[PDB]
From a paper:
To identify the nature of the RNAP conformational changes induced by −10 [name], we determined the structure of the EσB/−10 [name] complex by single-particle cryo-EM to a nominal resolution of 3.2 Å (consensus I map). Here, the EσB/−10 [name] complex displayed the complete cryo-EM density of the σB subunit (93% of σB resolved) with the C-terminal domain σ3 contacting the β-protrusion, and the domain σ4 inserted into the RNA exit channel and contacting the β-flap. The clamp domain (β′ residues 4–423 and 1219–1261 and β residues 1041–1147), attached to the main RNAP body through switches 1, 2, 3, and 5, rotated 22° orthogonal to the main channel, and adopted a closed conformation (red). The β-lobe (residues 180–370, blue) rotated 3.59° toward the clamp, bringing the β subunit gate loop (β-GL) close to the σR1.2 and blocking the access to the active site cleft. The β-flap rotated toward the β′-dock and was fastened by σR4 in a conformation found in all RNAP–promoter complexes structures. After σR3–σR4 loading, BH adopted a catalysis-ready conformation. The EσB/−10 [name] structure displayed a well-defined cryo-EM density of nucleotides from −13G to −4G with a resolution between 3.0 and 4 Å. Nucleotides from −13 to −5 interacted only with the σB2 domain that encompasses σR1.2 to σR2. In the Mtb EσB/−10 [name] complex, two DIS nucleotides (−5T and −6G) contacted the groove formed by σR1.2 (residues σB-R28, σB-L31) and σR2.1 (σB-R96).
In bacteria, transcription initiation is performed by the RNAP holoenzyme (Eσ) assembled from the RNAP core (E; subunits α2ωββ′) and the σ subunit to mediate promoter recognition and DNA melting. Here, using single-molecule Förster resonance energy transfer and cryo-electron microscopy, we explored the conformational landscape of RNAP from the human pathogen [name] upon binding to a single-stranded DNA ([name]) fragment that includes the −10 element sequence (−10 [name]).
Numbering used by the authors:
A (entry chain c): 29 to 53
B (entry chain d): 1226 to 1274
C (entry chain c): 446 to 1147
D (entry chain e): 28 to 110
E (entry chain d): 444 to 1012, 1024 to 1176
F (entry chain a): 1 to 226
G (entry chain b): 1 to 232
């Protein structure tokens, strides 16, 4: 679910889906 | 220690004089402190072969 | 990361706000209303603790200035996709659940009793219908810096605070490497920090060079990105931007094009992966010290580039106008060889400590020369050369090449401060390799200083001959209570070695919840454990027993994560297995080269006549009252007398003692400190008749 | 009964204190003799031999204080304590 | 570092450089040093042969904060510090810095080489307990080395029919050879024949008939090769020690050596022990991993049971019977009990080989509460207001705290980090004031020939047991001169008058059965200015009688102020010490029996009203005490704290009745200087011993002497004084 | 019961760069020490050749870029740090690299002088656009150990020179395992299996022979005492 | 190549049996490389002779004590295990020690066959009371290193055979240390300090020479694989 096009693929131990993406920091 | 101006006024009024026999005063003035090696018992030692 | 954190700071002090002294200690504590708005962990370690914080990841500020956080409302027990932002009051009138709460795929709460956070900070169970709002992510209460500490849920609050603060001191290394284990915040932090150039529009790259890159947009318009290289940052480090794309490659809009400092393919990378062995070793890693392999020094794993900056200006004076010239009064030609015709060092010339950096001559008035000076001037034929020497020189403890010179001239119509005609600044670049005294630190707030750098042949080595890159003592791990360090070590080894979870008979029980794509990993893979939701203990225990063998066909670590090492000196195996794994180590900016100071004799203050000076002659170290008490307790009366009279304040005593040392004679008797004569004059000025008297009472002169 | 001390811990401190009433007296006992030895060396070039140089033969460039301590430990000096 | 040494020793180096003719004049030598020509390093190494330098680690908190070391040139840019002196400097190698000075004149060099040398400061001034001893990683190595494990490889076995006994070695060399081959564990039961190690007193008196062991006399020993290797480090003639080296045992050994041997031997043996401990810590197999941190097996059942009980309490509250306060109290009690139960189960579960248990039990560092937190239950946690939260965290740092538990836990960490700075500042202020008061206390005389002396109980004799050593004899009467001869029941004198008390003399006094002994103390000295050396008594750091001219007031102030940092929390923390030394009115202000006699008390629910009828005669003194507090135990023959203040009883004068702290002024007024001095010393010592630190009484007797040194005058009469 | 047979060494070849040496019979408990002595001398005292300094046209220092290449001077220096070369000459020798036009420049584009060779012609050094070229002159010297780049800092050479850290070490990895034969009989010994991998500069046999000569020469001093 | 500063070895003498050997200076890291191998070689490679097993006709087994002797049978085993023997015969030669009447029996009282010798005739073995006797048969065999007796447990079949841990070594204790040395600005060269204590059979100097001989012979295997340029 990498928002940016060309992110490196690093699988995650994510058992929950985040309904909201992090806003502009 | 505290209340420098008040103590200065009191000392000036009383015209009090303090002996320089304490460690703090000797440190301030640059004299050897009256403890350890600074006491005249040990300071005035004559050594010859 | 340091800049991004600085921009998102919440300082409670300053003009219009409280002061350190006047502010009470009650405002420095955490409040149940900080959940989601202000990170309870990230905070300065010094006296400014509790007065400085940071926005949480998901916080948004209201027009009125009150901070808000997202909550997805649950209408009648079914969680809703749509979110709503609630300030503190609205939150304190409602029942807010926790993100971790088990939720059915249809939004139904499986547990009749859901943990709930309600008004006044109360936390207690409630029926699944009274609940009104639910969080969005478990990472909602942590800042950006604290959101990239893997296994933060296993570290204590103080250790986590220390690690988060130390993550912002890392120095960008020459070659950056992304962590094997790291949360999902790395990429977003790197992208939003703004130090990576990101393609504005989708296109195809025409030609890419080390300096620039041109991408032809689909609409026929070309755009060129200029990448600043070896540009000094605000704190002396270097900021490089290396393109990570190749010619003829289509780039999508918003894709990273080049990597700035601390970045490996568009994701934050503050350090390198090192093979860690956790055990005490000959006492060289005793009490937080660290042992390193010489392979790190020889391979430039932890090499860094620092750029100093010096500047001198020629200002007009009443006696004349200062000028920069290659000619200098009475200096040998060899010392002036490196300078060019304009009087400034040539680019690329190694400059050492105390060397001349730019030659300027200042006007001189009238000063009769001393007997021998004038006599020698007459004999040698060298005129007085009234103009003095004020050339800029490399301060004490500086070196490195001269990468660039920038000169501004009033003649060329450049804006300079009034009274200044010529201003030149020279940049000196130094390449630092890690050495004894430098600080390293993991992400879990476990600092350390390099106790020793052993040769590669002395380090303990695995059964296959691979030496360990660093050794950490085991006595500091359980006392400090940051077991997340060991968990990270285990997961890093599992990621580096790669694993293959057996599935011929079916997914094991411990692997039921693992993502379907996480049952296999190629060697040296990349994995992430989001904060407060990541790899559980059972997951690590299962993975440690499924790691792939080496190229030799043997498995090094056991099911417990320990391996049988060999002693690099004795050559015999250690009696018991030792924990090994790859850990992420950063290089803090507390380098030893900056800390070392030394003074024997230099400039002295004017009003107080005490030792003082710049970095050319480091100032003296303060000898406070507590040190004076320590000296008094020993009974050492002469040492204190010297420290307070003969090397601090005695104007004539200092000269006399320096004469005595440089000659054969003895050190004379100390005199009276200037700090006492000054006190007496200041006290007399107040019309207080102060006079020292002997036993007779006669006044004595001072 | 001990391995030979090396460095500024030789001669052993206990054997020195066996000859002086207290360490506060020993420090002066050694410092004054060190000053006397230093003055003798300074006046070695030319001057009246009023100050007698080191008693125990010194080593290769041994500090005057070390020589003073060694000759104190060898029972070659006498001191009288003030007040 | 050679750079710092060159920049700091420059004048000496330049003088020697011109002396050797490398440079023609001082100007050329200075230029040469500035350019750092290769000729300079030989001279620099030659000029610092025996020139001590002072190392200081701010904030210097006690006397041992400044030491004197012999410098040695080393590469790099970091000052190499000895592992053992970090305890004195309180320095952790995690980025800390310390300044280095340099004494120039001969007198300063002698002072830094005789007084301040680090080899002469093995014992702490405050308590006379070794401060430069194997501390953290050395302790683990020595504990592993000297441990005995049963059923190991090559252990001694008895004769079995045709097979002779195995495990008997003819010398330690043969045992080392067998261990190297691999047929003998270092820590196994062996029967070696020792020849260069003195046997223990028990064996020595038997095998040799107490004739005296000398090197070359062989005696059979039953021990482990590790213990034999350990004793080789101790000085020859020290009796064989055949016990596991827990930290306390090591401290006892070091203290005995310092008491019976010259300090040079102590430094040598301490260094050898450090080397051996570091060598054997690498091979102890202490590490950390998920396998080594074991979760308790039946934690879930205990947690479910106590959660059910807490739910019952919550339902009882929801009935409306109880309010908020009772509910919180009940929940906190239940969860404290649950935490203790889980801790006990965890302690039972772990074996003795785990690195965690080995580190904690060895005394190296840490306590079991941290182990319970990291593997058991972190338990209920503090609130910003300071009160426990009824909700405990049931997850350990191994399982992983949840979001709410972590957020609730952060409060205590923030509170502690905030309070550290305030505590250190308050400790500094207290030390400054203590130093200011006791500036003039210096030993001026050798003996005042005084007769007054405080009577200090040595060991109260139990009604059933013959004797019970007082728990704090180590701090009350351990380094005090004997004011009067301790005569036994008969005319024999156990200890002559004026002989300093010590371990053997105290043991002899206990054996003779004498319990009360009068000791000369600084608090009853007769010297006009300062305090004679006899009254002050044996020094702590030196270990011998304090020498004239020694400033004891500064040492006392530093000793009292040093443990202020770790003196964690009627507040009984540092504020208790500050108010006690400041002689302010205590917050509790418990009443005291003004006059001895029978007590006739009446219980007032709003305000307690206490009345006592004197036995000799007079009126009843009335106390109006608030009823919100709790009564303290009434002084009775049983002296059982559980006892309540019963009416109609008889109470000795000056004995407090209610819980709290008696006002020092009132006790002084009613009982006299002796009792107020005892009260102040005992109260401050109690607040210090509650945390765990120990400082000798004399360091407090000095401050109290300076404190109670005035005489208020009520009527001048024929005196000019107002 | 003296052992009649003295130790013998036999070489096995697992790969071109990797070999296994079997040494036995050895006295019990002695395999580890001998194997570790060989390992310690192999990783630190094998003479070799490495690049000492470089000189790129148009470049004055390493903190810059040359137009047309995709990476700065530091990146190309790091890439060259991996180059492996074997120089038979005992003096510094200079090699040339002249690549122009679009394409990639590899270690095979170098043209070493007589007595020098490059054993990894497939190494990647840099990438070139059609705009810019690259001409590099690099000096190869024979030594041992690890010499920091400062060696050429004080040489007083021109501004073009860029000192480079030198790593003269052909050995890559060394390992050993001991196969003890503990038996109730007095006939107990141990067998050593010493694996050694190299960088292709020298064969494992030559590295082992050099280490053995070093150790023999070092122990001649102990033998001399008699 | 070439060695900057040549290492040299200086013998020190602490006792007739003891010594302290300092090799200095050494290239950094060679301290351990030299010292550990040299120590193991000295302790395990130097050939010697020692008693392997003993016989006692007067006792049927080892649980009890031999009649007429104050010392326990295990004490006699311990005393006899420490006897220093020099043997020049490969095969295990037997020896007999016979005594009668009150007195003390010393190692010098054992008649040795051809070849073998006893280097400490003044050693004490046991004591005898009135009308006491003891005849013991102790075999002496050459070897090297230390060999336990449990491995020697299985040896044919006899009545009162008592295997004893034999020390086939003339050197019985070796220790080493390394200290920094300053031959130049490097200030990192090693200084091996080898401490060796031996029996009366071989002097420390001869023991070190034999260890060096064996170690050079062993490394000749590697050196003769090929001839290559190397430091001297
Ligand atoms: Mg620290
Ligand atoms: Zn007195």
């Amino acid at each position: 679910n990498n928002s940016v096009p060309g992110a490196p693929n690093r699988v995650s131990f994510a058992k929950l889906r985040e309904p909201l993406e992090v806003p502009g920091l | 220690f505290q209340e420098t101006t008040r103590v200065l006024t009191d000392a000036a009024i009383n015209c009090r004089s303090d002996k320089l026999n304490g460690l703090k005063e000797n440190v301030i003035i640059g004299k050897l402190i009256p403890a350890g090696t600074g006491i005249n018992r040990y300071r005035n030692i004559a050594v010859q072969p | 990361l340091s800049g991004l954190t600085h921009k998102r700071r919440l300082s409670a002090l300053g003009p219009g706000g409280l002061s350190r002294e006047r502010a009470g200690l009650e405002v420095r504590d955490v409040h149940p209303s900080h959940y989601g708005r202000m990170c309870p962990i990230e905070t300065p370690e010094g006296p400014n603790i509790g007065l400085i914080g940071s926005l949480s990841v998901y916080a948004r500020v209201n027009p009125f200035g009150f901070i808000e956080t997202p909550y997805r409302k649950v209408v009648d027990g079914v969680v809703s996709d749509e979110i709503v932002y609630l300030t503190a009051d609205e939150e304190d009138r409602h029942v807010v659940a926790q993100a971790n709460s088990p939720i059915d795929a249809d939004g139904r709460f499986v547990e009749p009793r859901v943990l709930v956070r309600r008004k006044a900070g109360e936390v207690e169970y409630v029926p699944s219908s009274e609940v009104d709002y639910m969080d969005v992510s478990p990472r909602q209460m942590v800042s950006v810096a604290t959101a990239m500490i893997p296994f933060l849920e296993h570290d204590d609050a103080n250790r986590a605070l220390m690690g988060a603060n130390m993550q912002r001191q890392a120095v960008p290394l020459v070659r950056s490497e992304a962590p094997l284990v790291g949360t999902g915040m790395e990429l977003r932090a790197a992208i939003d920090a703004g130090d990576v150039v990101v393609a504005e529009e989708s296109g195809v790259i025409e030609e890419v060079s080390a300096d620039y890159i041109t991408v032809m947009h689909d609409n026929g318009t070309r755009r060129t990105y200029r990448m600043r290289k070896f540009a000094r940052s605000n704190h002396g480090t270097c900021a490089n931007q290396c393109p990570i794309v190749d010619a003829g490659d289509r780039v999508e809009a918003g894709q990273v094009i080049a990597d700035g400092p601390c970045t490996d393919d568009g994701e934050m990378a503050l350090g390198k992966n090192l093979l860690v062995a956790i055990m005490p070793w000959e006492g060289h890693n005793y009490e937080d010290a660290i042992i390193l392999s010489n392979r790190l020094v020889e391979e430039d794993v932890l090499t860094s580039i620092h750029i100093e900056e010096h500047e001198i200006d020629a200002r007009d004076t009443k006696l004349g106008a200062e000028e920069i010239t290659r000619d200098i009064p009475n200096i040998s030609d060899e010392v002036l060889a490196d300078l060019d015709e304009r009087g400034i060092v040539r680019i690329g010339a190694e400059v050492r400590d105390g060397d001349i950096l730019v030659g300027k001559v200042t006007p001189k008035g009238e000063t009769e020369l001393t007997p021998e000076e004038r006599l020698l001037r007459a004999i040698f034929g060298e005129k007085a050369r009234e103009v003095r020497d004020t050339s800029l020189k490399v301060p004490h403890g500086e070196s490195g090449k001269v990468i660039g010179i920038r000169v501004f001239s009033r003649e060329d119509e450049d804006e300079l401060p009034a009274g200044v005609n010529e201003l030149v600044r020279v940049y000196v670049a130094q390449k630092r390799k890690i050495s004894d005294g430098d600080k390293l630190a993991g992400r879990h707030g476990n600092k350390g200083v390099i106790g020793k750098i052993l040769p590669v042949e002395d380090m303990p080595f695995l059964a296959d001959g691979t030496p360990v890159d660093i050794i950490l003592n085991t006595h500091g791990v359980p006392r400090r209570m940051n077991i997340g360090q060991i968990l990270e070590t285990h997961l890093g080894w599992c990621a580096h070695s790669g694993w293959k979870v057996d599935a011929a008979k079916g997914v094991p029980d411990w692997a039921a919840r693992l993502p379907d794509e996480l049952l296999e990993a190629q060697p040296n893979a990349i994995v992430s454990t989001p904060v407060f939701d990541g790899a559980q203990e059972a997951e690590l225990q299962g993975l440690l027993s499924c790691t792939l063998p080496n190229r030799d066909g043997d498995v090094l670590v056991d099911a417990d994560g320990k391996a049988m090492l060999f002693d690099g000196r004795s050559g015999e195996p250690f009696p018991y297995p030792v924990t090994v794994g790859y850990m992420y180590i950063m290089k803090l900016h507390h380098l030893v080269d900056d800390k070392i100071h030394a003074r024997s004799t230099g400039p002295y203050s004017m009003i107080t006549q005490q030792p003082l000076g710049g970095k050319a002659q480091f100032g003296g170290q303060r000898f406070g009252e507590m040190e004076c008490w320590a000296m008094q307790a020993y009974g050492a009366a002469y040492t204190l007398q010297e420290l307070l009279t003969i090397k601090s304040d005695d104007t004539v005593g200092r000269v006399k003692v320096y004469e005595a040392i440089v000659k054969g004679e003895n050190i004379p008797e100390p005199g009276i400190p200037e700090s006492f004569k000054v006190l007496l004059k200041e006290l007399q000025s107040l019309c207080l008749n102060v006079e020292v008297l002997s036993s007779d009472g006669a006044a004595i002169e001072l | 009964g001990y391995d030979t001390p090396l460095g500024i811990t030789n001669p052993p401190i206990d054997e020195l204190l066996d000859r002086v009433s207290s360490k506060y007296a020993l420090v002066i006992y050694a410092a004054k003799r060190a000053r006397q030895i230093n003055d003798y060396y300074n006046q070695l070039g030319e001057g009246i031999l009023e100050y007698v140089g080191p008693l125990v033969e010194p080593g290769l460039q041994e500090k005057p204080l070390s020589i003073a301590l060694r000759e104190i430990h060898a029972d070659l000096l006498e001191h009288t304590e003030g007040e | 570092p050679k750079l710092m040494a060159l920049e700091l020793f420059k004048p000496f180096v330049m003088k020697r450089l011109v002396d050797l003719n490398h440079a023609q004049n001082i100007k050329s030598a200075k230029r040469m040093v500035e350019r750092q020509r290769p000729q300079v390093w030989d001279v620099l190494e030659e000029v610092i042969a025996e020139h001590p330098v002072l190392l200081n680690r701010a904030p210097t908190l006690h006397r041992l904060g400044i030491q004197a070391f012999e410098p040695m040139l080393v590469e790099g840019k970091a000052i190499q510090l000895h592992p053992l002196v970090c305890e004195a400097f309180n320095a952790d190698f995690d980025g800390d810095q310390m300044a280095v000075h340099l004494p120039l004149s001969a007198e300063a060099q002698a002072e830094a080489r005789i007084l301040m040398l680090s080899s002469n400061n093995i014992l702490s001034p405050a308590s006379g307990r070794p401060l430069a001893m194997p501390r953290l990683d050395m302790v683990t190595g020595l504990y592993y080395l000297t441990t005995e494990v049963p059923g190991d490889t090559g252990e001694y076995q008895p004769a079995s029919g045709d097979h002779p006994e195995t495990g008997v070695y003819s010398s330690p060399a043969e045992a080392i050879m067998a261990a190297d081959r691999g047929v003998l564990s270092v820590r196994a039961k062996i029967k070696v024949r020792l020849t260069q190690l003195r046997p223990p007193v028990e064996i020595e008196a038997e095998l040799f008939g107490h004739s005296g062991w000398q090197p070359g006399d062989a005696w059979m020993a039953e021990t482990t090769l590790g213990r034999v290797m350990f004793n080789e480090l101790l000085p020859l003639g020290y009796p064989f020690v055949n016990k596991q080296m827990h930290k306390k045992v090591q401290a006892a050994i070091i203290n005995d050596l310092a008491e019976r041997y010259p300090m040079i031997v102590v430094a040598q043996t301490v260094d050898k022990l450090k080397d051996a401990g570091f060598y054997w810590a690498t091979r102890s197999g202490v590490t950390v991993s998920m396998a080594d941190v074991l979760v308790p097996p039946r934690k879930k059942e205990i947690l479910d049971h106590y959660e059910e009980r807490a739910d019952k309490v919550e339902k009882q509250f929801q009935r409306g019977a109880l309010n908020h306060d009772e509910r919180n109290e009940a929940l906190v009690e239940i969860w404290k009990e649950a935490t203790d139960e889980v801790g006990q189960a965890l302690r039972e579960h772990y074996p003795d080989d785990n690195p965690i248990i080995t580190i904690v039990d060895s005394g190296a560092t840490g306590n079991f509460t941290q182990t319970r937190t990291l593997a058991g239950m972190k338990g209920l946690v503090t609130n910003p207001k300071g009160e426990f939260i009824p909700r405990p965290v049931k997850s350990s740092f191994r399982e992983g705290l949840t979001v709410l538990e972590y957020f609730i836990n952060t409060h205590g960490a923030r509170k502690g980090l905030a309070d550290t700075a305030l505590r250190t500042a308050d400790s500094g202020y207290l030390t400054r004031r203590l130093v200011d008061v006791s500036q003039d206390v210096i030993v001026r005389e050798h003996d005042c020939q005084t007769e007054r002396g405080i009577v200090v109980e040595l060991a109260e004799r139990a009604p059933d047991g013959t004797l019970i050593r007082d728990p704090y004899i180590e701090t009350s009467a351990y380094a005090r001169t004997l004011g009067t001869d301790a005569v036994d029941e008969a005319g024999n004198v156990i200890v002559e008058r004026g002989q300093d008390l010590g371990d053997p003399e105290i043991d002899a006094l206990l054996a003779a059965g004498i319990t009360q002994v009068k000791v000369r103390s600084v608090l009853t000295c007769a010297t006009s200015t300062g305090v004679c050396a006899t009254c002050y008594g044996r020094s702590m750091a030196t270990g011998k009688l304090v020498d004239i001219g020694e400033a004891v007031g500064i040492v006392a102030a530093q000793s009292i102020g040093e443990p202020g940092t770790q003196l964690t929390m009627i507040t009984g923390g540092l504020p208790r010490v500050q108010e006690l030394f400041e002689a302010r009115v205590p917050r509790g202000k418990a009443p005291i029996a003004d006059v001895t006699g029978r007590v006739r008390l009446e219980d007032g629910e709003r305000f307690y009203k206490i009345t006592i009828v004197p036995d000799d005669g007079g009126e009843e003194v009335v106390y109006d005490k608030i009823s919100k507090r709790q009564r303290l135990r009434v002084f009775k023959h049983e002296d059982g704290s559980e006892r309540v203040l019963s009416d109609g009883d008889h109470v000795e004068v000056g004995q407090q009745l209610m819980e709290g702290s008696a006002d020092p002024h009132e006790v002084l007024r009613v009982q006299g200087p002796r009792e107020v001095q005892i009260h102040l010393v005992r109260e401050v010592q109690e607040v210090y011993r509650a945390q765990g630190v120990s400082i000798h009484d004399k360091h407090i007797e000095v401050i109290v002497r300076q404190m109670l040194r005035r005489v208020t005058i009520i009527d001048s009469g024929s005196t000019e004084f107002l | 019961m003296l052992i009649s047979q003295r130790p013998t060494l036999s070489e096995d070849v697992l790969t071109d760069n990797r070999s296994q040496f079997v040494i036995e019979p050895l006295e019990p408990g002695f395999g580890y020490t001998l194997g570790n002595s060989l390992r310690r001398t192999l990783l630190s005292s094998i003479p070799g050749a490495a690049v000492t300094s470089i000189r790129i046209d148009g470049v004055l220092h390493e903190f810059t870029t040359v137009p047309g290449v995709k990476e700065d001077v530091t990146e190309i220096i790091l890439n060259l740090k991996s180059l492996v070369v074997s120089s038979e000459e005992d003096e510094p020798v200079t090699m040339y690299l002249r690549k122009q036009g679009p394409g990639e420049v590899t270690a095979g584009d170098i043209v070493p002088p007589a007595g020098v060779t490059v054993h990894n012609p497939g190494m990647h050094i840099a990438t070139l656009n059609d705009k810019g070229k690259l001409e590099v002159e690099l000096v190869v010297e024979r030594g041992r150990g690890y010499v920091p780049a400062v060696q050429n800092r004080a040489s007083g050479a021109e501004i073009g020179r860029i000192p480079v850290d030198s790593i003269y070490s052909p050995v890559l990895k060394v390992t050993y395992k001991v196969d003890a034969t503990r038996v109730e009989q007095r006939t107990d010994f141990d067998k050593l299996i010493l694996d050694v991998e190299t960088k292709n500069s020298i064969s494992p046999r030559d590295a082992l022979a050099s280490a053995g000569k070093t150790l023999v020469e070092l122990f001649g001093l102990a033998r001399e005492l008699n």
